[PDB]
Design an enzyme around this catalytic site. Structure first.
Site, PDB file in Angstrom:
ATOM      1  N   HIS A 351       0.790  -1.236   0.000  1.00 50.63           N
ATOM      2  CA  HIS A 351       0.000   0.000   0.000  1.00 50.63           C
ATOM      3  C   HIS A 351       0.824   1.288   0.000  1.00 50.63           C
ATOM      4  O   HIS A 351       0.254   2.372  -0.037  1.00 50.63           O
ATOM      5  CB  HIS A 351      -0.956   0.024   1.195  1.00 50.63           C
ATOM      6  CG  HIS A 351      -2.002  -1.043   1.160  1.00 50.63           C
ATOM      7  ND1 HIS A 351      -3.262  -0.827   0.650  1.00 50.63           N
ATOM      8  CD2 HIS A 351      -1.978  -2.329   1.576  1.00 50.63           C
ATOM      9  CE1 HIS A 351      -3.973  -1.934   0.759  1.00 50.63           C
ATOM     10  NE2 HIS A 351      -3.216  -2.863   1.312  1.00 50.63           N
ATOM     11  N   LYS A 548       1.572  14.536   1.744  1.00 53.18           N
ATOM     12  CA  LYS A 548       0.263  14.986   1.267  1.00 53.18           C
ATOM     13  C   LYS A 548       0.234  16.494   1.007  1.00 53.18           C
ATOM     14  O   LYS A 548      -0.660  17.000   0.326  1.00 53.18           O
ATOM     15  CB  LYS A 548      -0.829  14.576   2.258  1.00 53.18           C
ATOM     16  CG  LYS A 548      -1.075  13.075   2.270  1.00 53.18           C
ATOM     17  CD  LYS A 548      -1.982  12.654   3.415  1.00 53.18           C
ATOM     18  CE  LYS A 548      -2.090  11.141   3.561  1.00 53.18           C
ATOM     19  NZ  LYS A 548      -2.905  10.504   2.490  1.00 53.18           N
ATOM     20  N   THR A 650      -7.901   7.332  -1.836  1.00 44.70           N
ATOM     21  CA  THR A 650      -9.292   6.921  -2.009  1.00 44.70           C
ATOM     22  C   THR A 650     -10.241   8.075  -1.749  1.00 44.70           C
ATOM     23  O   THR A 650     -11.335   8.101  -2.301  1.00 44.70           O
ATOM     24  CB  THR A 650      -9.673   5.751  -1.091  1.00 44.70           C
ATOM     25  OG1 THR A 650      -9.273   6.053   0.245  1.00 44.70           O
ATOM     26  CG2 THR A 650      -9.007   4.470  -1.554  1.00 44.70           C
TER      27      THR A 650
HETATM   28  O1  LIG Z   1       0.841   1.900   4.816  1.00 44.58           O
HETATM   29  C1  LIG Z   1       0.355   2.392   5.825  1.00 44.58           C
HETATM   30  N1  LIG Z   1      -0.715   3.220   5.804  1.00 44.58           N
HETATM   31  C2  LIG Z   1      -1.293   3.525   4.644  1.00 44.58           C
HETATM   32  N2  LIG Z   1      -2.361   4.324   4.599  1.00 44.58           N
HETATM   33  C3  LIG Z   1      -2.833   4.559   3.370  1.00 44.58           C
HETATM   34  O2  LIG Z   1      -3.814   5.289   3.249  1.00 44.58           O
HETATM   35  C4  LIG Z   1      -2.213   3.865   2.294  1.00 44.58           C
HETATM   36  O3  LIG Z   1      -3.109   2.843   1.763  1.00 44.58           O
HETATM   37  C5  LIG Z   1      -4.248   3.331   1.000  1.00 44.58           C
HETATM   38  C6  LIG Z   1      -5.145   2.180   0.559  1.00 44.58           C
HETATM   39  O4  LIG Z   1      -4.417   1.398  -0.390  1.00 44.58           O
HETATM   40  C7  LIG Z   1      -3.750   4.161  -0.194  1.00 44.58           C
HETATM   41  O5  LIG Z   1      -4.855   4.728  -0.906  1.00 44.58           O
HETATM   42  C8  LIG Z   1      -2.873   5.312   0.289  1.00 44.58           C
HETATM   43  O6  LIG Z   1      -2.324   5.957  -0.854  1.00 44.58           O
HETATM   44  C9  LIG Z   1      -1.717   4.805   1.184  1.00 44.58           C
HETATM   45  O7  LIG Z   1      -0.992   5.918   1.767  1.00 44.58           O
HETATM   46  S1  LIG Z   1      -0.848   2.976   3.097  1.00 44.58           S
HETATM   47  C10 LIG Z   1       0.868   2.038   7.091  1.00 44.58           C
HETATM   48  C11 LIG Z   1       2.165   1.555   7.221  1.00 44.58           C
HETATM   49  C12 LIG Z   1       2.661   1.179   8.471  1.00 44.58           C
HETATM   50  C13 LIG Z   1       1.857   1.249   9.603  1.00 44.58           C
HETATM   51  C14 LIG Z   1       0.547   1.706   9.487  1.00 44.58           C
HETATM   52  C15 LIG Z   1       0.065   2.088   8.233  1.00 44.58           C
HETATM   53  C1  LIG Z   2     -11.269   7.960   2.441  1.00 45.44           C
HETATM   54  C2  LIG Z   2     -10.782   8.363   3.805  1.00 45.44           C
HETATM   55  C3  LIG Z   2      -9.338   8.586   4.023  1.00 45.44           C
HETATM   56  C4  LIG Z   2      -8.347   8.440   2.897  1.00 45.44           C
HETATM   57  O1  LIG Z   2      -8.280   9.701   2.236  1.00 45.44           O
HETATM   58  P1  LIG Z   2      -7.027  10.073   1.296  1.00 45.44           P
HETATM   59  O2  LIG Z   2      -7.343  11.462   0.842  1.00 45.44           O
HETATM   60  O3  LIG Z   2      -7.033   9.041   0.208  1.00 45.44           O
HETATM   61  O4  LIG Z   2      -5.837   9.973   2.221  1.00 45.44           O
HETATM   62  C5  LIG Z   2      -8.889   8.973   5.278  1.00 45.44           C
HETATM   63  N1  LIG Z   2      -9.723   9.141   6.312  1.00 45.44           N
HETATM   64  C6  LIG Z   2     -11.059   8.964   6.243  1.00 45.44           C
HETATM   65  C7  LIG Z   2     -11.905   9.172   7.470  1.00 45.44           C
HETATM   66  C8  LIG Z   2     -11.681   8.551   4.967  1.00 45.44           C
HETATM   67  O5  LIG Z   2     -13.024   8.365   4.860  1.00 45.44           O
END
Ligand SMILES: O=C(/N=C1/NC(=O)[C@]2(O[C@H](CO)[C@@H](O)[C@H](O)[C@H]2O)S1)c1ccccc1
Ligand SMILES: *Cc1c(COP(=O)(O)O)cnc(C)c1O
Ligand SMILES: O=C(/N=C1/NC(=O)[C@]2(O[C@H](CO)[C@@H](O)[C@H](O)[C@H]2O)S1)c1ccccc1
Ligand SMILES: *Cc1c(COP(=O)(O)O)cnc(C)c1O
Lengths: 810, 810
Positions: A351, A548, A650
């Protein structure tokens, strides 16, 4: 009231009313005279829950009879949000419940606001798991979400003096009506101990035991009568634990701390023992449950035909050595056969490529906590490296690059490497991300096993993220093209033939205006803050992180303010700039960014010359329930990460679906969104991945931008000199220092193009009709980003199962 | 099946069956195919609970409308046992539920065995509170039990190698269907801090806050449709508590430890901080709740007319200074008026004269934890001692004897003295005990305020302790005299006119034989131990303590064994000697006594020459549910405490009611039992209180008894030489040393008379007819020992309220 919310039949309304009164009386032990508003919420929740139960039992017995291949989605995070409305939507009960509660003198929306978010996740990764569960149920897959029932989810954020304060999210205070404890399926989980080698094999002995007690939560599919299960484990001490007497009982808390609290970090690896315990806890309990269910349908050749395990990043990566442990040590399979079964069963989703997010566990921790697993990991590594050596003879640097074991000051296990070796499929979460994996961090692995690597572009559920949060939009769409699109979002393409329809244009704009008015009211009621609902709603909501680039947005905001102050009597398109999101508690720079945003608000919002032309608001405690309110209200979606850093995103998809235009970089899923809608209907700016690489080769020098852009120089001087912190002149010195000397994410490099692009946004907003037509073109091409599409692809290309929209009997 | 268990009407049985299936489906989320036996228990429990709810709501709204004086019974212990059967008995649903469950293919008694005891007490003091709640409801009093919802009750006792092992009683594991959480009535409780003196008055500031969350449990009266409330408080940390982040969340456990575990000591004061916190916690939360309810009916002159607070010993004694604190510091009443209100509201029950049981809290603890309360206690003491000085001028030793503050190495507060000063009534719990209070430990206080001192002889509820546990006996009694006796136990006197009735004699003996067969079977099933059901069942069940003299029973057992070994071919009346009870975990001598009992069993039960003429069994894990099984089975009740040490006893009354004869000393309520039944129908032996005093004046010399009684010398030599511990010859050296040199309870002094009295027991048992006639004379005169009588006396003589058997509408 509106069609998409279902029928309000006389019998159903009558039956709902009496069951509501039954629960208020028998379940809550109240009458109408002493009933609190929260009591009314619970009565409604129990009433709606009753309609799930039959389908839940029927679904699970159906899976027992048919014995389909089972999908197990293992995650440390499930960001579910509220359940009441979602359940009504998926059961087609929303209008009936609204009518029933109205007839009892209650406002259902008011009752909905009482429900706590199930905040068992940090952001995107946790919310993706939630959307995925919804789609798996809607697509009729025999799927189970497995995780931890955290006593405390993501903290509630309070802003005090412009600073983030964290408070515990005691989400189970009043009880959780949706879950069912299953103490009968409690399983032991082992920790510490040591490995003994007998004549028969290895044995893991002298361990400490923690019990894993499951709680089941129903996951309803969209109007197909499928109800799947999310099983979350809670840690319990055994009754003989530490058995002076009083202290021994009190020390049971130590064992039970495993499921106490969610680690509050987004895209950041914190290598703490408690986190490792959580990871093994979920894996060990889940695998026993999987194997139990498999045996109760000896011969593990068929295991991969009946079981798929999806690893949500490396957090549950211990499933790989745990499965090997069980197969080799307990079931007595030979290593090679067990490995074949393991590889064919497991698949891994990456991810993020941010290096600080990658899990690299110190060997000494695994040595102490999970001695047998470390031995198995070493054996996996030796056999894997033997394959690499035979494929690329003499390439000794490749061997060290691909090793599961990283040598150095402290030896570490690279869990991503373990996952690739032990999975038959590895995917990224957007096309650009999956390509980056193959070209950079997993390049060596792709060269050894190219067939293993796939893409699965992320998505969001259109149930929660359109029908639930934006009924007005869902309705005006349904009036034209019917309701089939809710479980077949590609049908939104039919809306392209309405882009020149005057009635539809007016309806789309009216729905947005209504959403903005409603949100503007919410701001005044729950936060006593005043905004202009005619202004452009410029929204950036997501976790606070340098990558971000909330800071880049801040720079634009200050630019707008400075331009107004220089030419106050010139017309500018009014904006309400809204930024929200939580900072990880230990992330100093993220907390400084929050303080900066509030400090800018303090100056801008009280300047008489600005008036109501520019407002800057920090949205406190951003979470799923708040996203459901703000996203439908937004005009402009800020998706402005440095190219190559946001794996997918997302939130971007949520905004596109709800009638906001996007200003963004060609990063993550933004690339595919622009491709679907047409680049002419997106506000694209800034460096592409290739431009970032070129700048890195040359060396990023922020000073150059400062020297050549006067407007940028002015802002940095304002920050440094204390313009936004009069009583604390040096408050933002860390921010300035980072931007000028240590900016990993090249904020200045995209500043000029961002500001110019923002001018093009303002220009288009001056022409309501053409703004709305571009919006229609976005909504109409958002179909690809349904998690139903994503899950259908996982099902066919990874899990080897066919989805279905066929309904089960009610 | 039997009359006293109520009607099994067609409609009620039909309705119970469908509600059972409803709960199994909707509440437990199961069907009959996967339903565990525990699921069936819960379905039944929820079904029965539904029948409580209407009456519960109606009762409480009735109290709100009529506004009677409210009785608040404050206790740190409520030993409730199981609730299912008791609820059915009191609602007249037992036969209906039996029929309904039988028709569904289930055995109700088997389902009843699944329920965990609510073991929130240690023994007699906790069980008295439970019986009292039942009687208060049955007598229609507006009464509330207030306590702590311990997460862990009294430990489960396992016997390993003849030694007590403790394991945590995780009684809430599977959930508690009887309780209803009331998060809406959560109240703050303050600890630590400091006192500030303003112009307006004293203020308690900088405190730490713990939240008290109430859980309500229904208390049904006997077939009068009254359902009262027991409210138990659970400790919760506030959400800002300690608010790195993770550790701050984990440290919430510190605050919540207050309600984690019941202190496992019987008749023993352990002066630990955690215990003091528990005591204040229950008091502070309860008093706020009382005052809230009083205000919602400003003028506190009427407070004592609408509120009575009964202190169950000194454990909730902080109610006195807490009430003063609230009235003076918060409501701004002058000291003298507040004190008047406090005294008229509070009444205190003393439950023991053993000096090690009396609460004497170190001043330094109160100073730190409750600084304002210490100040109030000092002020109470000064004003109280001023009264003493005016009444007894010049008597300086009286002043120091009566002081609330004990001077010495560590200054302590005597909580009994505080209670006497701050209560309008002080009572003992049996006539002999109440007289001992006036003559010894409270003599000075009685001389100052004789009107304050009363007796209230203890009792037991005939619902649990006859109808529930011994339906067969209740039935044969009901056949002769009807059912009115169940709530008017004095009617058992009518049974005296059946003492020469041949049918009744045969029925009484048949019921006992049935009970013994049933219990003998239970022993083989759940513990695989074999006994002769024709033997005399000689039972001593109660907590293990030196003053209760399980050791004296042991000496008799060894005497019987030695006599058999000396004359093996002589006839002796066969006995099964059963001893059971828990030892406090830190009470070394009590644990040694358990080991001795098992060691005697090991020798006696395996000696071929003894055969089945003598069996010694240690009843493991003695608790309320086990008492319900063993007491109906008993022939002989051992109540053999040293005269002056057992304040009342209540086990004694349970045995009398269930057709056992009593061998006992003239101690506690035994005196009144003998008086009621006639001394000729009791096996009385040993020193009276006056004899113990004479021996103390002269000096107790155990050596004298050893020198003059050869049979006793033989036993001590056997113990010392390792006859009962071959592999560990000196194992019982501590026991021998204590008996010979440091025996506070004069075991040897009563040995000869005890053994002779036991011979008279055996002689009578050889004549079944006359044994049974004496039994009838006991059962017939047991009426005085109903807790209905006890509570009626509290009501009229202390609380100023009239009881009632008038039913409320259903
Ligand atoms: O990878 C981590 N967190 C993420 N949070 C995100 O939102 C990520 O995954 C999403 C779903 O695939 C992606 O849309 C997002 O770009 C990415 O940053 S990856 C993470 C890594 C280590 C510990 C806790 C969380
Ligand atoms: C969809 C969602 C996110 C992820 O948003 P990004 O702009 O893709 O980082 C984070 N937090 C909440 C509460 C959401 O509903
Ligand atoms: O007094 C205590 N325990 C008692 N337990 C009892 O059973 C006592 O009370 C009963 C009810 O009045 C009496 O029947 C019994 O004789 C007495 O020992 S008193 C006590 C004292 C300090 C801490 C915990 C308990
Ligand atoms: C009645 C009872 C007691 C008190 O018995 P005594 O012989 O009076 O000490 C103790 N424990 C339990 C479980 C009881 O039911």
């Amino acid at each position: 009231q509106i069609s998409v919310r279902g029928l309000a039949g006389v019998e159903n309304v009558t039956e709902l009313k009496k069951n509501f009164n039954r629960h208020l009386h028998f379940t809550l032990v109240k009458d109408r005279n002493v009933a609190t508003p929260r009591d009314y919420y619970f009565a409604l929740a129990h009433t709606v829950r009753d309609h799930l139960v039959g389908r839940w039992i029927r679904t699970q017995q159906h899976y027992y009879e048919k014995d389909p291949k089972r999908i197990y989605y293992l995650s440390l995070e499930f960001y579910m949000g509220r359940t009441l409305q979602n359940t009504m939507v998926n059961l087609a009960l929303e209008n009936a419940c609204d009518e029933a509660t109205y007839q009892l003198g209650l406002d259902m929306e008011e009752l909905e606001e009482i429900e706590e978010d199930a905040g068992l996740g940090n952001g995107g990764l946790g919310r993706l798991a939630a959307c995925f569960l919804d789609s798996m149920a809607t697509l009729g897959l025999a799927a189970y979400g497995y995780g931890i029932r955290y006593e405390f989810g993501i903290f509630n954020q309070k802003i005090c003096g412009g600073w983030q304060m964290e408070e515990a999210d005691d989400w189970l205070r009043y009880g959780n009506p949706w879950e069912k404890a299953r103490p009968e399926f409690t399983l032991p989980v082992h920790f510490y101990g040591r490995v003994e080698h007998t004549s028969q094999g290895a044995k893991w002995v002298d361990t400490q035991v923690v019990l894993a007690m499951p709680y089941d939560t129903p996951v309803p599919g969209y109007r197909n009568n499928v109800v799947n299960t999310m099983r979350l484990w809670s840690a319990k001490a055994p009754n003989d634990f530490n058995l002076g007497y009083i202290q021994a009982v009190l020390d049971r808390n130590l064992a039970e701390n495993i499921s106490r609290v969610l680690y509050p970090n987004d895209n950041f690896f914190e290598g703490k023992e408690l986190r490792l315990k959580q990871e093994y806890f979920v894996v060990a309990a889940t695998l026993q449950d999987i194997i139990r269910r498999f045996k109760s349908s000896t011969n593990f050749d068929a295991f991969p035909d009946k079981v798929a395990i999806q690893l949500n990043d490396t957090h549950p990566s211990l499933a790989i050595p745990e499965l090997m442990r069980v197969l080799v040590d307990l079931e007595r399979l030979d290593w090679d056969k067990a490995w074949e079964v393991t590889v064919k069963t497991c698949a891994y989703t990456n991810h993020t490529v941010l290096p600080e997010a990658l899990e690299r566990w110190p060997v000494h921790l695994l040595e102490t906590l999970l001695p047998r697993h470390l031995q198995i990991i070493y054996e996996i590594n030796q056999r894997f490296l033997n394959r690499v050596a035979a494929a690329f003879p003499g390439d000794v640097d490749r061997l060290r690059r691909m090793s599961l074991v990283e040598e150095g000051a402290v030896k570490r296990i690279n869990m991503a490497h373990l996952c690739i070796a032990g999975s038959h499929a590895v995917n990224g979460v957007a096309r650009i991300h999956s390509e980056i994996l193959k070209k950079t961090i997993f390049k060596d692995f792709y060269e050894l096993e190219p067939h293993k690597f796939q893409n699965k572009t992320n998505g969001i559920t259109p149930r929660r993220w359109l029908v639930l949060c934006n009924p007005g939009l869902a309705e005006i769409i349904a009036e034209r093209i019917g309701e089939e699109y809710i479980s077949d979002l590609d049908q939104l393409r039919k809306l392209l033939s309405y882009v020149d329809d005057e009635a539809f244009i007016r309806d789309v704009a009216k729905v947005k205006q209504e959403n903005k008015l409603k949100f503007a009211a919410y701001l005044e009621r729950e936060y006593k803050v005043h905004i202009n609902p005619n202004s452009l709603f410029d929204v950036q909501v997501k976790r606070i992180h340098e990558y971000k680039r909330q800071l880049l947005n801040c720079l634009h905001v200050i630019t707008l303010y400075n331009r107004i102050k220089k030419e106050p009597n010139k017309f500018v398109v009014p904006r309400t700039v809204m930024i929200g999101g939580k900072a990880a508690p230990g992330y100093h720079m993220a907390k400084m960014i929050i303080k900066l945003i509030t400090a800018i608000g303090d100056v801008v919002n009280h300047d008489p010359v600005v008036g109501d032309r520019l407002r800057v608001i920090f949205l406190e405690n951003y979470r799923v329930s708040l996203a459901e309110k703000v996203i439908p209200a937004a005009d402009l979606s800020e998706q402005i990460s440095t190219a190559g850093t946001e794996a997918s995103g997302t939130g971007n998809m949520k905004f596109m679906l709800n009638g906001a235009l996007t200003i963004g970089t060609m990063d993550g899923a933004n690339v595919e969104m622009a491709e679907e809608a047409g680049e002419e209907n997106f506000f694209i700016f800034g460096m592409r991945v290739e431009d970032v690489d070129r700048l890195d080769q040359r060396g990023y020098n922020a000073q150059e931008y400062y020297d050549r852009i006067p407007e940028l120089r002015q802002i940095i001087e304002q920050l440094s000199s204390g313009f936004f912190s009069p009583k604390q002149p040096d408050l933002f010195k860390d921010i300035v220092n980072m931007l000028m000397h240590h900016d990993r994410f090249k904020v200045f490099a995209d500043y000029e193009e961002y500001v110019k692009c923002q001018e093009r946004v303002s220009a288009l907003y001056k022409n309501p009709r053409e703004w709305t037509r571009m919006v229609i073109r976005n909504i109409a091409t958002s179909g690809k980003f349904s998690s139903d599409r994503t899950i259908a692809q996982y099902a066919r290309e990874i899990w080897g199962v066919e989805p279905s929209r066929q309904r089960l009997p009610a």
